[PDB]
């Protein structure tokens, strides 16, 4: 009833426009054989409704994972994706989305000895997609804990504001490690959503209906 008024050309609207169009360009549509006109328009609309919304899902996962990754770089906060269940559940749910899409394409029917190892390489990416994010968010924070525990002992044992350069040379290293944490917090969201587009767009291929009759020449 009473929704808020939005300025046109806001910075979040521009940013989310660029983000959504980026993730929508990962699984582009297929250019048909016939030229696109009013004859081919229901076939194009129908192909656009038999394609999964991987653009919307991928920017959903990109936005939630980059916000949970950048929570771990604000003070007094831990990343939610440094939990095993959170990050690994996002990974298993992307893999289950790709599998449910691929199962509903054929029949909801589950598919030599070369193919079960292809299956245990396909069922591993449920584990891999989640725990890459989880171990990347956990390992930098763990190294940060350890190396600032080693960086606190030398101003503990020596004087405060005395013998400065041995603490300066480890505080520069801690600063570089939190900068690497920012880079990893952006790149792992990017890698997760690129891989979600890849895994779901493996099964995002249907039959273009097209014209079954024509008036040629």
């Amino acid at each position: 009833s009473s929704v808020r008024d939005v300025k046109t050309g806001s910075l979040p609207t521009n940013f989310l426009t660029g983000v959504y169009r980026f993730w929508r360009s990962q699984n582009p549509a297929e250019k048909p054989h016939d030229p696109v006109n009013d004859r081919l328009l229901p076939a194009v609309v129908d192909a656009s409704d038999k394609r999964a919304s991987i653009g919307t899902w991928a920017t959903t996962f990109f936005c939630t994972i980059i916000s949970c990754n950048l929570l771990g770089l604000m003070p007094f906060n831990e990343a939610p994706t440094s939990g095993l269940g959170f990050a690994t559940g996002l990974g298993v749910s992307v893999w289950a989305t790709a599998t449910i899409l691929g199962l509903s394409k054929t029949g909801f029917k589950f598919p030599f000895i070369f193919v079960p190892l292809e299956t245990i390489s396909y069922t591993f990416r449920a584990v891999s997609l989640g725990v890459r994010l989880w171990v990347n968010m956990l390992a930098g924070h763990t190294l940060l804990h350890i190396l600032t525990g080693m960086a606190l002992a030398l101003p503990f044992s020596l004087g405060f504001f005395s013998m400065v350069p041995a603490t300066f040379g480890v505080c520069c290293l801690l600063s570089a490690l939190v900068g690497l944490e920012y880079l990893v917090a952006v790149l792992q969201s990017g890698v997760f959503s690129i891989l979600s587009t890849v895994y779901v767009g493996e099964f995002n291929h249907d039959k273009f209906i097209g014209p079954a009759a024509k008036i040629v020449k």
Partner: peptide
């Protein structure tokens, strides 16, 4: 930046100094 970090580590060590460290000291 590194001065802010060194000021922060010195202030947070000095604000409660007589404490047994949780972090592994180097035998000092």
């Amino acid at each position: 930046h590194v001065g802010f970090v060194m000021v922060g580590v010195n202030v947070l060590l000095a604000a409660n100094f007589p404490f047994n460290p949780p972090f592994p000291t180097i035998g000092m």
